[PDB]
Amino acid sequence: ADHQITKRTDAENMYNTIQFLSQAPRVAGSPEELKAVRYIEQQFKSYGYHVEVQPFQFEGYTAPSEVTLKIGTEKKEGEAFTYSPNSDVTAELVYVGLGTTADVAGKDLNGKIALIQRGNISFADKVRNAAKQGAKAVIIYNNTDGKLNGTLGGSDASFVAAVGITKQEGDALAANLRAGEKITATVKVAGAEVKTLTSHNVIATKKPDANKKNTNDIIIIGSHHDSVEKAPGANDDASGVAVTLELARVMSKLKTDTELRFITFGAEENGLIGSKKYAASLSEDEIKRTIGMFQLDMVGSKDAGDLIMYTIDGKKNRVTDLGAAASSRLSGVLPYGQEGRSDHESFHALGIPAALFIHAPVEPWYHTPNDTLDKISKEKLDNVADIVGSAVYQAARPGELVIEPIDYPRRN
């Protein structure tokens, strides 16, 4: 059965998809993401699919033009978190540990700037908790080297300007404050702005066409078509889009007894907005009938590691069982691990078996201007299409689904 897939997976087709999409970054809600949506829609149509485009709005964020952070007089290096409000405050700096509801409680922060350490709770909770006590601004310092780049999740007027700084420059301030030093700081954020944008999900569905063998099962194969600012996103995630499109083309040449939904989600980098919006469109019957959701994200980099399957809870499910079965016949042992950070999380949330297929550890070009076409491996793209396609086909081919018992290890 695998041969029906493996003899049809065209690596050149996938390479070409990536070439077209990665000519420029595809920031969610931008003209470039719209261009990708149109392109993807047209390719699905070319394979004979009826296509639907689901629109949705979300709050976008334009990084601030001026990020000035100063400790008394010396100018420091800091980066405002996404969705950070604007500010022009100069006041005493107060250390509030991790910034929990208790840490900031027993401390006078009214009109002051809070110094918080990165820990477990979200950057959003810290800013929010500090702002609740009167803090006019928040300075968060990293736990490791390198600049601290984070996001407050989404817009929220309850926030106050928030900027991040490296661990070294943070432990120093915290130490002096604990030592009893009275420090004054300056936090000025200008340029930041939030506006409503529209993104889209592209859905191509192949209804079962066997006949008496048709089941009422549904399988979703997805990827996301947006990329981060300044990143051409060849591997993240044009690669996933490419495999999604090619597998749709491959399946159009075969009879199936399972409904297949090939989807490219928008605004994945903004917090899985697209997939959340699509998941929310499903009926209770559709949810119970979806036997598995396969997410393809970063599956073609010559500089990435081996293929692995990630689940939200780090447990095996129907999708990892199918992935492992296919791989066992085609390439060898395919491990699984625990990780979210992609659209499969939106389906796992509904109780639908889901897994992310990705090459880990990821390449160093991840989310950089270096995530380009010349880093792509046709051989790897073809391998992923072969494995994911055969895993899906094990279920979609006419006849009852049978998954033989096979062992595969969990790997972190």
The residue ranges that bind Zn ion (CB under 5 A) are 6, 9, 55, 236-237, 297, 379, 382, 386
Give the SS3 label for residue 76.
strand
CB 292 within 8 A of CB 391: no
Look-up: residue for tokens 């700081």? 185
374 is in an annotated binding site: no
Closest distance between Zn ion and the C-beta of residue 106, in Å?
A: 39
Q: Give 10 or 88: the residue with its C-beta nearer to Zn ion.
A: 10
N- to C-terminal Cα separation, the chain: 31
Q: CA–CA separation, 141 vs 103, rounded Å?
A: 16
Residue 233 buriedness (CB in 10 A; 0-12 / 13-18 / 19+): buried
**Which lies closer to Zn ion via its Cβ, residue 9 or residue 87?**
9
- Report the distance separating Cα 37 and Cα 223, nearest Å: 12
CA 136, chain centre distance (Å): 31
Q: Residue 294: what residue type?
A: F
Does 169 carry a binding-site annotation? no
Residue in 260, 223, 194 with CA at minimum distance from that of residue 36: 223
User: Alpha-carbon distance 236 to 298, whole Å?
Assistant: 5
Whichever of 6 and 142 has its CB closer to Zn ion, that residue is 6
Q: How far is the CB of 235 from Zn ion (least distance, A)?
A: 8
Nearest residue to 98 via CA among 113, 118, 80: 118
Least distance from C-beta 104 to Zn ion, angstroms? 32
Q: Least distance (Å) from Zn ion to the CB of residue 398?
A: 22
156 marked as part of a ligand binding site: no
Instruction: Provide the minimum distance between the beta carbon of 377 and Zn ion in the complex, in angstroms, as a whole number.
Output: 8
User: What is the closest distance, in whole angstroms, from the C-beta atom of residue 6 to Zn ion in the complex?
Assistant: 5
Nearer residue to Zn ion within complex by CB, 6 or 327: 6
Residue 297 is labelled as binding a ligand: yes
What is the rounded CA–CA span in Å between residue 278 and residue 348?
A: 13
Number of H helices, E strands in the chain: 11, 16
CA 44 to chain centre: 23
**Closer residue to Zn ion, CB minimum distance, 28 or 96:** 28
Is 41 annotated in some ligand binding site? no
The answer to whether the annotation marks 359 as part of a ligand binding site is: no
Place of tokens 């086909």: 393
Shortest reach from residue 341's CB to Zn ion, in Å: 8
Instruction: Report in angstroms how near the CB of residue 316 gets to Zn ion at its nearest.
Output: 23
Residue 324 near residue 309, CB atoms below 8 Å: yes
Closest distance of CB 380 from Zn ion, Å? 9
The answer on whether 50 is annotated among ligand-binding residues is no
Q: Is 268 annotated as a binding residue?
A: yes
The pair of three-digit structure tokens given for residue 1, joined into one six-digit string: 């059965």
Q: Which is nearer to Zn ion, 6 or 301 (CB)?
A: 6
Say if residue 236 carries a ligand binding annotation.
yes
Count CB neighbours of 323 within 10 A.
Answer: 28
Q: What is the SS3 assignment for 152?
A: coil
> Between 79 and 237, whose beta carbon lies closer to Zn ion?
237
| DSSP-assigned letter for residue 236 | I
Q: Which residue has the tokens 């661990």?
A: 167
Q: Give the CB-nearest residue to Zn ion.
A: 9
Q: Name which of 103 and 236 has its Cβ closer to Zn ion.
A: 236
Residue placing its CB nearer to Zn ion in the complex, 205 or 331 = 331
| Buried/exposed 38-76: b ≥16 CB within 10 Å, e otherwise | ebbbebbeebebebeebebebebbeebeebbbebeeeeb
Instruction: List binding-site positions.
Output: 9, 200, 224, 236, 268-269, 284, 297, 367, 379, 382, 386
Instruction: List binding-site positions for Zn(2+).
Output: 9, 200, 224, 236, 268-269, 284, 297, 367, 379, 382, 386
